Design a protein around this ligand. Sequence first.
Ligand SMILES: Nc1ncnc2c1ncn2[C@@H]1O[C@H](CSCC[C@H](N)C(=O)O)[C@@H](O)[C@H]1O
Ligand SMILES: *OC[C@H]1O[C@@H](n2ccc(N)nc2=O)C[C@@H]1O
Length: 327
Amino acid sequence: MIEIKDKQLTGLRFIDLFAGLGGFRLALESCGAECVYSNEWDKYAQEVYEMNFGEKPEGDITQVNEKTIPDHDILCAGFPCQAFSISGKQKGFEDSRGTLFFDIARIVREKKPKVVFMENVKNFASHDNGNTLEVVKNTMNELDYSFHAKVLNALDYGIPQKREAIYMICFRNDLNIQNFQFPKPFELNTFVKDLLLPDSEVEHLVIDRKDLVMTNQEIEQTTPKTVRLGIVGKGGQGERIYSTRGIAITLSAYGGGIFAKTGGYLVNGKTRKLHPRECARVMGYPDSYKVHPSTSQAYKQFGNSVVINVLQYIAYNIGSSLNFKPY
DNA sequence: GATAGCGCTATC
DNA sequence: TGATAG
DNA sequence: GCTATC
Ligand SMILES: Nc1ncnc2c1ncn2[C@@H]1O[C@H](CSCC[C@H](N)C(=O)O)[C@@H](O)[C@H]1O
Ligand SMILES: *OC[C@H]1O[C@@H](n2ccc(N)nc2=O)C[C@@H]1O
């Protein structure tokens, strides 16, 4: 992740809903905020959270009495996105994992925090003819908050990963916050090969499919895009090899394919998926972060996590706005 | 749970 | 008649 | 992401 000398969010307290690995925790904390509550019902995500924050999140948010949630300035929430993803059934709100946002709303209505910082997949912005995004928007205003949503790509904030996401920032009206802005993009100068480990430590990840099919020659220069080199199987998800000379694809939490969740990369002429540590780096996570012992769960967690760096930039702007108080 | 072929969508 | 990524 | 396999 990036370093932020002056911490705008100093003095402000936040909530880590749908905690997961604690992406919003790492993002916010760096800006000076204090986390006063986290929630996560998955046994394994719970584990890693405790391995890194010495704490265990509260289970099922759908059963927590909002009156229980601690008072706070910023409510962070990257609720479930398997229902609006371009890779699923897209039943959205008509899905068991499709609601959850109404729990976010249920909590704001009772806690009225200065800011609501949310996150979800890019498709969420167009899902159901933009009507489902409109519902989040209308819901928020009803509660008396402005609404700033926007889809960003990590390949624009120094992270070599084609990971897109919708980011929705909400300010309370009584605060008349009018100068909020999303972080400006900038040239990427880090690529997949720059985050890899010594092939010595990942020889167990190597795979050799006699049905491997190269479809393009290795590139010379690096690029802020994903360059495919080959295909295995029918080339479906998890069956596509990319160059470490370009950037990394989206890391998925439930993706299948032989190169399940991370995708395939041609490393030293060796075909293989990424190591958990590498996924961490790809998500802008510090090496000091301890990954879950179960790798399947680890890929799964980084799979549906958030990129630290982008959150940091956004958190910074949230403070710069909250901190602009002229007479 | 962990593994993997898949099979349909969105954007172009 | 195509092509790639989720 | 879904889902059948073990
Ligand atoms: N009812 C519920 N209560 C608590 N957590 C829930 C939940 N339903 C889904 N979740 C959790 O929602 C999370 C969405 S993933 C969000 C990622 C997270 N902000 C990060 O930085 O990693 C998952 O970890 C899932 O287990
Ligand atoms: O692109 C959808 C696919 O990737 C995972 N994911 C991607 C991007 C964001 N913002 N969140 C995610 O969880 C989920 C899905 O499996």
